[PDB]
Structure 1
Amino acid sequence: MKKLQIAVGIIRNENNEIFITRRAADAHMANKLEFPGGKIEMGETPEQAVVRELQEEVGITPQHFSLFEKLEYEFPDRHITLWFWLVERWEGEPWGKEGQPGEWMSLVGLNADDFPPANEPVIAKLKRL
């Protein structure tokens, strides 16, 4: 009955663009282009879980918050929770420590192909823009 939670937030840049985390560059499933905010589970609260890990996945001081969308799905004995928060701004550059360096990209062209298919229902909403 293991349940793993995940909280993410698309950081908004100075040009209506957000920085997402990609699987570096191939050699590790390049089609898993996801976003920061992993390990929020631990033992935090639905609200403090992201807010705390946020510093861990951004480290900087960004005007980040809001909830764009949230998806809750369960895998064969593995409950995977994915929370999508709506970020509005970020000072300097996002660093934190997620494990996959990112760059300021435009979400206007987000793709369900580049990202992990495990979170399509969520992207299906924003993808349509």
Structure 2
Amino acid sequence: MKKLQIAVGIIRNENNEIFITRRAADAHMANKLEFPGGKIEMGETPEQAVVRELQEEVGITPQHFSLFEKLEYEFPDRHITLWFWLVERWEGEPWGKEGQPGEWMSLVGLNADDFPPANEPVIAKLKRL
């Protein structure tokens, strides 16, 4: 069973909305809503990974961000450690830079069922802010 470290960014604007993308139909966790992010590569830190991943996926550079949550989740065929970074300041305007759907979603309207199950405690904690 493969083991991965994943860094993702919770991109929150001044109107309490989060920038959310939707995973491709042929990906792991296909068609699920997601915080943009990806695998932490050898030789880079979790902080460097969330910056690089957000630059690649949605075209922003996060800055002055914080670790909102770190958790582990065992999927049917892989074990993942997720680093959830709260990103409230950035350079750029997020968009579907890799051709993926992306949109702003009110925090209060997020439905954890739409996201991978690993995100459940994070979505709950976000609604408690």
Which of the five TM-score ranges fits, normalised by the shorter chain?
Answer: 0.7 to 0.9
TM-score, with length taken from structure 2: 0.74
Aligned length: 129
Query: 2:87 and 2:6 mapped to 1: Cα distance?
Result: 16
Residues 17, 107 of structure 2: 8 Å contact kept: yes
Per the alignment, do residues 41 and 26 of structure 1 end up closer, same or farther by CA in structure 2, a change over 3 Å counting? closer
More strand by share: 2
Post-superposition Cα deviations, 1:1-32, rounded to whole Å, max 9, x if no partner, equal 52112111111224232211124799998862
Where do 5+ consecutive residues of structure 1 fail to align? Answer: none
Deviations along 1:40-93, one digit per CA (max 9) or x if unpaired, are: 345421322222223112323454621211112234562211111111134452
The answer for the alignment partner of 1:26 in structure 2 is 26
Deviations, residues 85-108 of structure 1 (Å, cap 9, x unaligned): 111134452137456321122112
Compared CA separation, residues 126 and 36, structure 1 to 2 (3 A): same
Structure 2 residue runs without a partner (length 5+):
none
Q: Matched residues in 2 for 1:43 and 1:57: separation?
A: 20
